[PDB]
Symmetry: D2
């Protein structure tokens, strides 16, 4: 047809006004808000351009040199290039390390590794969820298995010491001798400290287990050399490509090659087989191009500088909050985030996140090591990656600290009008249903959005 | 250091010349070639524009109803809109059907359903791979379990009758009574005929099993009303959004809501089990930019232009099959009801394994596939051919007849090379003969030229030559 | 307190009058009844004497080779002797066959083999229960797994052809290619014909599976050479020691040793895997008194008298079947090659469910069983009849013809009662009609008298009326 | 035939001379030896008579009131009677407790319970093997699963404190919150102390798990009221019928009936279904008769007296050994056995058991809580049930203590001639290959066998 020939060439603005409008409103919402959620960032224009390329059309099952279909000359150049930049970015010798770049995301990357090295019902140990662990590391209760990791495998968590906020390696070492894990996971979603990879490797070798690092949250810090690298002691390293690496959504699996002890590593073929034809079908080539572009950007001195600023910003933010009387779990941080214990102010993350949200300050609740209840998490997780990508510096994060402080005070107030004992649903009602309050929110929001508009919003020119 | 901000705003062309160059060469490769691989298509510009939006930066966990974090006012509008268009596009009453739009792709969508309704080691039955089934429907040998479906669940396949090329429903009905499946899969990767959903539903109900349709390959034909809908008898329907639906890569899970049976009645519990399996079960944050792309593709799929596109797709397949029959080729089941056909090359004394390589060198893309008969997977007898991609470029019946002759020229050439390599020669040797033999290499070059010239006559959908 | 020692030396008759009385009544019940249940027999006095020996007090763990504790000089002589007699009795070369004699019973013997060669969730194929298979070969429905074999492993049955009553090897061969079993079971609980071990071995080798024979029902016939031996084609053979072997309750596992295949050759690893599964895998200390009983039964089974007993067993079954055919009864497969027959009572308008109850009240023991046809398990059409027990009491062909008429009288009576209860009457009601109805109760009493008088004419093997 | 008619009536002595001879030699070996293996005993004549009855011929699938075959009038009387005596013997109200008497032995009884309440891959926790646990409670290494319990289910052990020799309940309570067991096992094969059932029940209820007691070793002590009963806090109790109960080999499963909390107990049908048709076929009726006879004997005042003597004998034996300078794990015992730590004499159980065996003194090696190696167990497990059934009293066990002591000295000697460092195979050679030694053995053996012949050997008149 003559009209069908152009339906395929019509711009989004004309083709789908409704979706186009939603993107515009979301673009604007991101501009006037303060993003403190530790897992978010702003991808560069170049990365986003690669996502909408014609690579979306190429279907290519398999791997370079092992393709099911033909016509993959350029797709091979792409994937090969992506793998080369991944090893390079982390300073890895291709004779000792290899990498798979097809995982659709972080969760799928972890699952493929378990499938490959652990097998159904094999034992896996990971940091407990309320102590800062991730769902894919295992999540189950006494009556039900929630995470797919816990459903298809046998997981058992290890905890942090509630008095220090640090991972209790001694207890882990002891429990591992009884549990007999086939794989131990070193990775976190809400832990402000570096992990003792060396100690974990010793514990893993003691039980004949593999040591897998999930560096999703610190992958960017690692490339820049701002926090120790897990590649020195781990057998496998998984990671997402967004978060601190600042790329598009996707995942990667790094695995050791060569001699293990003369015993040789068999990780490569097991992992590759698990990703495909095991768990996935055709790879998302447009996403692989986006990652390639993100990895090149991550190797620039500018990126290195960005990462140093990220950590500096976190330090300034934590210091400013301590000065305002806030308690930081473990007293501080070594990376991009901090867990703030709000008990030091008589409130909780559950109520605080809602008030701050209404004020255009995004962050999320999280349980603190102590916490005797998950229905009333004591802390707030705060991260600096996103705002640092917008150019905020130390002086800016001190102002951010005051805005957050204003928020906490407000959440406390809506709490003093409700009485020391009241449900979360009563609190939210008194929040949006009170002259002085919905009015307190409106005022703080205005100051927050004005301050936020002073900074550039990375991405495509203008949606 | 100051150039860090100038780094996040820099265009791809300046930021990464190497990747930019690869995209250009791939864009050009797609333009001068003839795409006959049944699972490929060309996504519209609008869809691709949605993929590179700022939706990439939004991390949301959970569903529109209950999210983990805040600031999802617009993400909720998006996902909700996407779900509404999905039900609408397939003519489904939201009181009887619901839909999850977060699966990252087709394989993940199927796996989430198994995880939800079957549970570890539960029994699943699907069409055998060499008979046209998909990996995610189960794949194992007597010594090893390859597909994740076969590793975490207990799968057993059902076959097609090798004499008719059709699915043997009688044998399936019998074997199901002994196997006791908890779920039966109705879906194919290389089957040219409609599926008897009604018959499969009866067999499923007989064993108390769920009937799941994987309509990935025909999802576009279904929307246009060109082939019967699986929503009439199935409990669950999974699908990819690319392939015939012509969207970006992603997956969707449709499930029934309301009353299942009586006596006094019992309700469907598919919704919460499936939603829980997708998240927090198997996935983390949804890819919102991909959900926007799907939304855009679903709106385009409801237009009369799309419906006309789908009619042309089937008409093209019919013309292509007729033209090949006229040239003496054997088509499994003798023909097709949809977008593809499986060509049995034994009728010409060669096989798909060698033919696909020669055709590839001539810029004609397609893939080998075993035929129902075939007593060996190392020497598949057929070639799977699809019309979706080329129809999106505007080819009509007369164009597919010309395509048929180009393919025929290719087969003749591969036969010439096969006779030159020997009898017990290996594919490895066949490919080397095709690579370093000026004689054949000259035949290839000539045919390639004609194929690429003919292909340049048609527009390549997408962005402005990117 | 001083009478404690006088307590450990006191005879059962004085020590426990109540138990002693029960044994007396049971001994008498066995004497005046006609035992036609195919799985029963009467163990010799010698065997029973070994069971009550001081071997009961010896706790030994491990095997003759390597034990956990000491003081096993004689226990080693015993187990070693038992293994030697087992191989000998079946004419097996110890260089090609080995045997484990610790299983506590038949079910445990099978389970240990599955545990050793299959592993959790491994695939196993066995004869379907309603077609004559045993529980330990797999038993599950579409909603629940009943047998431990079906709970810990993945089982799928194969069936007999309902028109011929024979095992459909063709369908099994086909289904095995799709199911991929790791082990196939050749053994039955209610099948009157010989098994085609050769054919099953070919099918097993085709799928790389092990072939395991469960010869529990025919172990005695095999020793005597009255039916073909499964040791010619199987990799493993399990069996109970009671039933036709006429020993005490226990089980044994025979496994091949040496070279399995070539190319350069590979060895059998069955021995250590099986031994490890029995102990320390599934069992603790072996029952030595039971191992002594088996040893004694194996020596008796190698005598010419035993061989003659086994020939009489088969001849009796043939006469019993012929006599029933003459009375108009239908026998599945038309006859038998061994010790039993499945009688299809549809040929008389009744079913095994009601017939077994009436016959029981007349002191004629047998059990119901579904026939290949049967469209319902709640109304089994047949009766399984065996001759081992009565042949051990000396009945000959002319005696089994009289037995046939008594059974016939029973069937006529159950038909009379069925017509009196109604059409859609329940078994519950059928049993109540048979219980509180002087008319039928008078018919029962009369037939019972004739049956018990005829049965008292024969000796009851075992101890002196105990 | 006329000769076949009598092959079945011929006595064992004439029918099978070879087997008959073996029984005679074994009967004699039992008479002249000193049985100190804690799991052995001598069954009464009455019990043995029931085993060789005509009950061996009756095939009866199912349970009373639920039979597959007919002609079970007396078999029903038997099983019913056996169940009634089992409940009675332990003072259980049939409205609150039920019992299955078909398990062929102890291991099968445990396995059926796991099959019924845990299901494939369900989690189970039991006392670690080297700390006194039993195989059926779980046994696996970092590379292989040995016990069927560990192969079909997911097991993890709990340990004893190596400094006190007692079960560390605190650590168990902590690990259970991470492991999430569906069932916890309270039972031992080599533990001289009573178990804190109350504490274990609290831990089980805390994780929603079932508490199962395996009282195999103390079932006789329990009936007599010499050690606390596990029926006060457990949901299920399994046991063998030999060992201290002094019956034939068989097993039983006791389970609670009635209201659990209005939630009702579902143990009965699950357990019955698992035993049959789940795991077993026809029950061994002759063994059920033997158990019935053993249960009646266990309820007599004479049996009660026997059990008091058993414990008194153990106390005297332990005191006499302490006086000779031997170390007893946990310092003593509350029951029929003791674990002797031979490190206090510079030798190990591995070597000592062999020397004592050569001297006609039966016992077995066992690791001590400390032990940094299973290939060189430090202790010897000694039990008094068997010898007490032969009439030994306190004064007799003091003499037994000296004989054992003489044995230890000899094992040490063969050890001083071999040098502080030598393999177990060299030691055994120097034992049987030395004039003074094989001569030392012969002498002690003579004294041991003479002393042993002074006591009656329970059982059948004379084989
Ligand atoms: C966020 C996060 C994930 C989830 O990533 P997805 O790409 O959303 O699937 C996985 N692992 C860790 C350690 C994380 O922080
Ligand atoms: C000895 C013992 C067993 C083993 O009994 P078997 O009857 O040999 O199978 C099981 N459990 C415990 C606690 C034991 O002491
Ligand atoms: C292609 C295809 C798939 C796989 O989809 P992916 O999106 O590539 O992961 C699944 N099912 C069917 C029926 C297909 O044709
Ligand atoms: C009877 C029978 C069994 C069961 O034996 P048990 O000793 O009763 O436990 C197993 N297999 C077959 C083939 C049988 O006939």
């Amino acid at each position: 047809w003559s009209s069908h020939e152009q339906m395929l060439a019509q711009p989004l603005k004309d083709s789908d006004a409704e979706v186009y409008d939603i993107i515009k409103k979301e673009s604007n919402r991101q501009r006037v808000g303060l993003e403190l959620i530790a897992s978010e960032n702003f991808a560069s224009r170049a990365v986003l351009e690669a996502l909408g390329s014609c690579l979306n059309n190429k279907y290519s099952l398999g791997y370079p040199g092992q393709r099911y279909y033909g016509g993959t000359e350029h797709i091979d150049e792409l994937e090969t290039l992506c793998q080369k930049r991944a090893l390079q970015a982390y300073g890895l010798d291709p004779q000792c390390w290899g990498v798979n770049v097809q995982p659709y995301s972080g969760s799928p990357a972890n699952f493929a590794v378990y499938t490959a090295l652990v097998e159904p019902h094999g034992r896996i140990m990971g940091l407990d969820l309320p102590d800062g662990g991730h769902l894919t590391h295992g999540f189950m209760t006494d009556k039900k298995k929630i995470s797919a990791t816990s459903i298809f495998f046998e997981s058992m968590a290890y905890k942090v010491n509630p008095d220090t906020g640090y991972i209790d390696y001694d207890r882990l070492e002891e429990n591992a001798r009884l549990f007999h894990p086939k794989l131990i996971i070193a990775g976190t979603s809400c832990y402000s400290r570096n992990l003792d990879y060396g100690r974990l490797r010793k514990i893993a070798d003691e039980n004949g287990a593999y040591l897998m690092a999930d560096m999703a949250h610190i992958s960017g810090l690692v490339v820049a050399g701002v926090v120790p690298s897990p590649f020195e002691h781990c057998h496998v390293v998984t990671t997402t490509t967004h978060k601190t690496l600042r790329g598009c959504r996707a995942g990667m699996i790094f695995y050791r090659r060569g001699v293990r002890s003369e015993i040789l590593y068999n990780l490569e073929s097991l992992i590759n087989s698990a990703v495909f034809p095991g768990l996935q079908g055709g790879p998302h080539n447009h996403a692989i191009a986006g990652v390639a572009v993100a990895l090149k950007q991550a190797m620039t001195p500018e990126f290195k500088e960005y990462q140093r600023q990220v950590v500096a910003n976190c330090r300034a933010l934590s210091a400013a909050l301590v000065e305002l009387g806030y308690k930081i779990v473990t007293g501080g941080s070594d990376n991009h985030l901090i867990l703030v214990d709000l008990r030091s102010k008589g409130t909780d993350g559950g109520r605080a996140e809602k008030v701050l949200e209404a004020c255009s300050i995004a962050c999320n609740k999280n349980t603190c090591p102590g916490d005797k209840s998950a229905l009333r998490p004591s802390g707030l997780r705060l991260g600096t990656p996103a705002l640092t990508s917008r150019g905020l510096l130390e002086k800016d994060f001190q102002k951010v600290a005051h805005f957050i402080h204003r928020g906490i005070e407000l959440t406390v107030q809506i709490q003093d009008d409700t009485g020391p004992r009241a449900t979360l649903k009563e609190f939210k009602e008194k929040l949006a249903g009170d002259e002085k309050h919905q009015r307190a929110v409106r005022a703080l929001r205005q100051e927050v959005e004005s301050f936020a508009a002073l900074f550039p919003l990375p991405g495509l020119p203008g949606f």
